[PDB]
Amino acid sequence: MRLVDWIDTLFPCFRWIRTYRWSEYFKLDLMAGITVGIMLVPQAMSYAKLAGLPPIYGLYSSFVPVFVYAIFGSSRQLAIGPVALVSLLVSNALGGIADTNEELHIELAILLALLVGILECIMGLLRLGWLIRFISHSVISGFTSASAIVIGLSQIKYFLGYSIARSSKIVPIVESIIAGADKFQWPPFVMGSLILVILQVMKHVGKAKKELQFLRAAAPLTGIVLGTTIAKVFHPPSISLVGEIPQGLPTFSFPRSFDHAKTLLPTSALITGVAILESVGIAKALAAKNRYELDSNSELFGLGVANILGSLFSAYPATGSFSRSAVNNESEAKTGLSGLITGIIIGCSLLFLTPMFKYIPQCALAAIVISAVSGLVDYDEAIFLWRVDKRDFSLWTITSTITLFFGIEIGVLVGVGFSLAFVIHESANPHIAVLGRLPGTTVYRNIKQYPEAYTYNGIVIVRIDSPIYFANISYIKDRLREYEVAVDKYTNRGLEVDRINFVILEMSPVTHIDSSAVEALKELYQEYKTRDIQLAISNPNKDVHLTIARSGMVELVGKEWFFVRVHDAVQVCLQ
Amino acid sequence: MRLVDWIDTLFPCFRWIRTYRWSEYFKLDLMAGITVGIMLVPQAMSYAKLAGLPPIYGLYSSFVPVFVYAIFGSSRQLAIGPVALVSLLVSNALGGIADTNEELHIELAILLALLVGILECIMGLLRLGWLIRFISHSVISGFTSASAIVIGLSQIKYFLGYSIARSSKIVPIVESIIAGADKFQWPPFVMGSLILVILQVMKHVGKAKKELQFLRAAAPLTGIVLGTTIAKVFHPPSISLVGEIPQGLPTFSFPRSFDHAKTLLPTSALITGVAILESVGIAKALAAKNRYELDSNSELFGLGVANILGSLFSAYPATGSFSRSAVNNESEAKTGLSGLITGIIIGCSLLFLTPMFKYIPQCALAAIVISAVSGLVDYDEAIFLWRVDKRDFSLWTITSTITLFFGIEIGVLVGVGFSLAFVIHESANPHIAVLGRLPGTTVYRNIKQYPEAYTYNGIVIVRIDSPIYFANISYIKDRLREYEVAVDKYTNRGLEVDRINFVILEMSPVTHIDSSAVEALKELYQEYKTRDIQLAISNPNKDVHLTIARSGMVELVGKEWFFVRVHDAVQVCLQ
């Protein structure tokens, strides 16, 4: 194994190091990295506050994994760090375990990051990511919208100024807000409302214009730069600051709370599922847009390695960001260096900007989180689903409502269960076509023509428009037994009639068959002999023919009933 | 609603009452009922002993539900009562809950029967039985074989003569047997071995001959008639008798142990799943053999009603029997009256034969259970799978080994999970064909001919041989993006080359498309415009065309790129 291949195998970053056009790529990467870091620092602190951890642990979650991802990540525009959904899930798990320790929370979050990284590395090495991508996008969209509403209603407590009941359901949150309304304060609410209005106005102006689009990245910072100013001029009494923030880079430390690890598998999987469904999707979309190759397994392995190293350096789970990756995308980011620069910015903060961070009001961070999650309430997809596919709209509405009123875990379980139910329903109801004229197709909808001869009395030609395996064998057995039922009805009448003498199976679209398929075929052949019906096979696939010959069906039904076309099969059936 | 329709709707039994040919049907039904009752009484007591309940509760489980099933059951040959697998599952649940109460066991079993009946009625009314039939037959066969081995190794303790450790795993059972080998007794082992040998010889002789086939039904009784005789002549000291058995029909009593009901849902579902997979399968096979209609939903409703009434009359869950239903089948049973007569026989025992039952040795019942489950070790299917389908053989072996060494619940979970994994793998990897000549098909395997013109430079014709929905949309997106990757590779070379200008989709086999399909199609069209590739739709289905028009794809890509055939599409692409 030479170095040129071994290095590329272990370090995917070199995939863009060798093909690096310095002149334009360096300037574009530097600008994109600076922009993403500026957008990220306040967002990192706000998301850390959302998860229940002290704000500094957001910056850690952006420092070490980013440097790791830029070395082990396949995507060249994806931005790695805290996100709203993963922070919400981490907060959910920690609150379900620890109440007010403020010290077990940190260790639990770091252990959760380590478990998520290990699960991601396992699912990337084994290439088991396809086991999750069966979940419909409507379910994910509804769950994300409900999570966004829950996040906003949880963060409104900083605007109100009094602590509210901590829960993931809307009803207890609203009940607590109503109960505590007697402790309302005007200064924090006014500050939060003004900051949120300014942030949303800046974001809308940036998205409306094509050239003045950097405001989206400068919106989270500017609000703080605004809010702190009022905190340093008028000094409102009822506002709260983030307090002292430790200064310095995080140090190496193995997790010490493995005793709760078994409690964290249900969350560690869930977060990992998000990375399979959202982060990998963002990476693939960006790769398709930017004309480079990407695979869903190496990306998961890179995310897992980044999470593992972040856990080793006091970080909580970090995945791809819908907002930051986009902002990187229109910043003309070319390689993964834009990540490294971003990380460097974080490091600079951890060395120089922490003393100035203690004057940031908490309502400003709450407003930043609210602005970030306002774009996650994705009702446009709900309208689109209502217009196009009402089954998908029903799935979206059910998932959103259940996640809103019941827990996050209940909503996730309902969404996954409904997706599995619909997958099983589709697998268990294959399309079966009753063919008419020999070079023809389904008579019910496709072709109604009569080229002087369309169907033959006594012969039924059936095509199974799918591979036959254990999931759909029962439906096929029932459909083929309908002809026996028709024969029984004919023989049970008061007059002698029999219009089913031969049944021909078109197995040309049948890609493959398993043992259940040949067993059922033998059973139906025996039942047809009981009913005096002849079974024929028309267009066996090579693999299908080999399986049929191995199972002994050819000897049971006779070699003379196996053909290569429908024309000769029907011709010998008439004779 | 007239009586002729209402009565038939509520009471399916009348389906065979109206069409009843007295002369032959009465004699055949009477003989079949007597035969099944004779085979059932000892089997009922033996299975009740297997479940951990006192033997009499087997007879109850054959008395009231049978009379109910004959009124509410759709099958005319199915025999309802205790079975080996359901008894094993009931014993597993009870031992997991109650250790040696011998009184909470009865109430727990009756409550389990009520819960099973309610779940079956719910799944029959809602017609949700298709949610379970995706499980492969190999998984069920392996689980049943492992359960049979576990049942035999649990029942060998009566042969040994000393109590062994109660578990559902082979290793603790063998360890306990080795530990207790110092308490071995010769009389019970000799009695059990002789009874088992006689039973197996009788069963083999009955199955070998065509006319002397009643011995299979007389084997369980004869052994008792044998064993008791030695218990009444030589009186061995170390043998154990079933003891006093209460006399009389069971009385009405609602369950009183609802407090454990939530613990019993995981078992109540599992047993119900068995009824969906095994009992309904037996009913459908018998109906197909005997030339009458049967549906999988009314049968589940009848089983649920029978279970509910049995629970109301002190019975534990009862489903269809592989052995007794067969014995009914070659006994020329025609209607459901054969069930009623069988039940009557049970009633006679409960009125007259209970005093004579106290002399039955326990080793005789153990031998009966061992003989009953010896036929459930279904290695013939394992050999068949090894010969035909090695994936199914691997599933069978994994399920059997895990159920043998680990718990029943772990084996069930592994089997269901592997079946789901394979269903998802099949759904997520649809077949996509690269067509050659216009009235042609897949070029890789199907057709290699060259009718003077087969493929065109610059044009790729792709057919998706499946409906497009949320499960397989990712694979289709990747397959369609492979052409973009090829274009990128062509443009990244040292020479100017571009051999992908048009991509045509054959959507004739695409039965239907959902919202995810049209969203992905729009995304791929936009990416093709980025790569300067034209997207065309060749054979849209009527529903597919309607969905495409509703989603706005026709306006986005242009109406001029929608056709009805591949010939004209390629003709306009060349021009």
Numbering used by the authors:
A (entry chain B), B (entry chain A): 70 to 644
The publication says:
AtSULTR4;1 forms a homodimer and has a structural fold typical of the SLC26 family of anion transporters. We show that H+ transport is likely mediated by a glutamate residue (Glu347) highly conserved among the plant SULTR family and that the cytosolic STAS domain modulates the transport process.
The final model consists of residues 70–644. The STAS domains are swapped between the neighboring subunits. The SO42− is located between the N-termini of TM3 and TM10, and is coordinated by side-chain and backbone atoms entirely from the core domain. A negatively charged residue, Glu347 on TM8, is ~7 Å away from the bound SO42−. In the current structure of AtSULTR4;1, both the bound SO42− and the putative proton sensing site Glu347 are solvent accessible only from the intracellular side, and thus the current structure is in an inward-facing conformation.
